[PDB]
Design a protein around this ligand. Structure first.
Ligand SMILES: *Cc1c(COP(=O)(O)O)cnc(C)c1O
Ligand SMILES: *Cc1c(COP(=O)(O)O)cnc(C)c1O
Lengths: 422, 423
């Protein structure tokens, strides 16, 4: 029995989705098949950015595996080709790269570059976030359970959300949120840490897909820079065109970060991450450290990353996601008008969510109804999930090859699922 | 244009070998070809454990890539099959696994498990070691340049080496080295760190390929456990049958570590690492943390690691490395007797080295002569490197598919190169 064999090797704690674990044995594009032969529409996975079993990615890997696959202490063209392609997707002073093998490795390295450059240790993060699984990341984690107490060098911020707030009240929410930033900064200075970084997910997805007031990110950047710190945009959830309106999530705001980190989608499932930064910051850190990552930038990893960028450009996926997101938003707003169990509609491009609420007039978060909806949608052949501190934001985030025919399948089942609640 | 295009993107500090960097465009087995068409014998690379362009590994990866490639929050058989195969290579209480994507990820996680389990933060490492590139690892690094000052929670040990010492002086060396361990432990305790771990490469390769007196590792383990700490064997250099005499380098000592880390060879070049541990340790850490690594244990990484183990088993590579290492050692002992520029013969299996020295009677380390030999061997069609705090231990560590014919090519060029040094 597979579950028992898993528990005897990797253990019973490593997480599994659903009340009954699901065994997935094959996939193609947006479609997955279980060990019983049931077929599902993927409304969840972002690692297969260009679709399950994409054959252009598979072929690029295979052909390089039959050539050579050594570390970067020997010259080889593939890593340079990939670095050129990836950096062509950045403007401004973001013109150099460190490659890694995961998003956690990228965020660990970005915090290390910042601590050395600033001479400060303080970290500003959201109060319900997750950026990876190393010791330095565990000490700043607020959105998942870790044994490490929150570090004395960390201040957690309540990131503002305008969802459901009267427009007249927005400027005061912005003002109070920026005063909380000044107070965090002043506390870190008084206690001798100073300010090293502000680190954020531009979609604020773990937090419940927040809609920020205009001027908050710009305001935080100005205050952090007056204090001698840097801004890191973690693009693991929001990058590679997921938002539709730009390649990188930070482009939704009036900010150009000094450091950008990435992972998940980048190699369609191959282990790849990166830190994109300025010439000054890369040169300084290399003068000061004999830094080397053995697997980073090998020719096969580089072939995989090049095939992902080439495929997304040839198939126009970012522009498609921008157009389709406009359609999905209209459909979800109609659904919210018709269901007493739906609150705000959140997100853009191919990252959407809806708040699930009691229909008794309270508008209280309904996490038990949300779990019903996730399990019912699985029975109906659709894989979705949830996010947020009240466990009630129903999330829709498929591979970036998801089209209008797929949107109509997902949205039709979701309507039937909502209609079946009490 | 390639070198300049590199420096404009990933920068001019990321390291390159040789005075003139080499552009390697293809390989097969132990052989590599440069952009000018020159062919070289690989006496250096351990990442392509089963040889360059190995087709069984390539086929296994590609077939899984046509099937599915999702994280471990859905059940899938390939990760379980690989975990069973890897854990069958271990004995005793080493019966659970955390997968990762790199050796640094593995050693970061092992230090984290240990700090939470012990309630202590103190680290014992050698005084010329390297275990990876995270913040927590930089703070303990002694064998490579980093900006971080050595952490106050760290004590660096001078690991004893019997190479070239009279047998009658070995017991005093062991007694004095264990007293240094007693002192380091007491110092950690007085400062309020306590002892969390002793972390070591069993080959002590970065340190210059040391030959330890019997009882040193075992003595360190007893003292660390009495202090409430754990032992971590870093198998990135010594694992997967590199030493010939066992699957894991720790087996050269009479010790069973609580935690074993690995990387480099394990996927032939695919990004894979692991921490192997006990049931008690894995269960404790998962009860206390919602631990998850998104790429770890995906089906394609699992296919790669299963193909490496299957190939090394089918081709009998560990046993072949044990027999071939015995033959290389005899040849290198003959070379050392005859050359006034060679000191001791070091290593075993397919990880060997020799110490390059002046022939003026001083026996002083000769780093500049070592560099001459490395460049000369390149010109002769052989890739080798060096290690150690004096930059004078010539290092040879080929793919594990390297055989007797290849050994004779390498060793014959090495003798001719040695003979060309000034008198
Ligand atoms: C998944 C994730 C990470 C960690 O990536 P890993 O590859 O599991 O190390 C970091 N940041 C964000 C926002 C993530 O979603
Ligand atoms: C290379 C190496 C590491 C780090 O491995 P990466 O895969 O580069 O993180 C750790 N320990 C030892 C002994 C190594 O040789």
């Amino acid at each position: 029995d597979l579950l028992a064999r898993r528990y005897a090797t990797i253990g019973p704690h490593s997480p599994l989705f659903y009340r009954q674990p699901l065994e997935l044995v094959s996939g193609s594009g947006v479609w997955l098949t279980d060990a019983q032969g049931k077929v599902y529409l993927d409304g969840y996975n972002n690692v297969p950015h260009v679709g399950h079993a994409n054959p252009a990615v598979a072929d690029a890997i295979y052909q390089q595996l039959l050539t050579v696959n050594l570390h970067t202490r020997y010259l080889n063209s593939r890593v340079v080709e990939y670095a050129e392609a990836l950096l062509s997707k950045f403007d401004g002073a973001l013109e150099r790269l460190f490659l890694t093998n995961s998003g956690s490795e990228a965020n660990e390295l970005a915090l290390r570059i910042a601590r050395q450059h600033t001479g400060n240790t303080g970290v500003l993060v959201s109060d319900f976030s997750y950026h990876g699984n190393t010791t330095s990341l565990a000490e700043i984690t607020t959105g998942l359970t870790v044994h490490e107490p929150l570090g004395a060098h960390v201040r957690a911020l309540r990131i503002p959300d305008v969802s459901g707030i009267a427009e007249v009240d927005v400027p005061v929410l912005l003002e109070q949120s920026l005063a909380d930033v000044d107070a965090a900064i002043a506390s870190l200075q008084a206690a001798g840490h100073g300010v090293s970084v502000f680190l954020f997910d531009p979609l604020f997805s773990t937090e419940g897909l927040l809609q920020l007031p205009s001027g908050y990110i710009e305001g935080v950047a100005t205050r952090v820079r007056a204090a001698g710190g840097l801004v890191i945009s973690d693009e693991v959830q929001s990058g590679f065109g997921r938002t539709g309106s730009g390649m990188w999530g930070y482009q939704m705001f009036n900010v150009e970060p000094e450091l950008v980190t990435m992972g998940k989608p980048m190699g369609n499932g191959h282990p790849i991450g990166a830190v994109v930064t300025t010439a000054e910051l890369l040169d300084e850190f290399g003068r000061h450290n004999m830094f080397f990552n053995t697997f980073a930038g090998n020719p096969v990893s580089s072939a995989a990353g090049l095939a992902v960028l080439r495929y997304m450009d040839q198939e126009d996926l970012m522009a498609k996601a921008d157009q389709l997101g406009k359609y999905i938003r209209k459909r979800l707003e109609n659904i919210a008008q018709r269901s007493g169990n739906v609150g705000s509609v959140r997100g853009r491009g191919l990252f959407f969510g809806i708040d699930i609420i009691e229909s008794d007039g309270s508008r209280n978060p309904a996490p038990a109804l949300t779990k019903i909806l996730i399990e019912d949608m699985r029975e109906r052949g659709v894989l979705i999930s949830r996010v947020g501190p009240h466990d009630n934001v129903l999330k829709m985030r498929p591979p970036l090859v998801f089209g209008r025919e797929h949107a109509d399948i997902l949205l039709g089942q979701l309507e039937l699922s909502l209609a079946s609640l009490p």
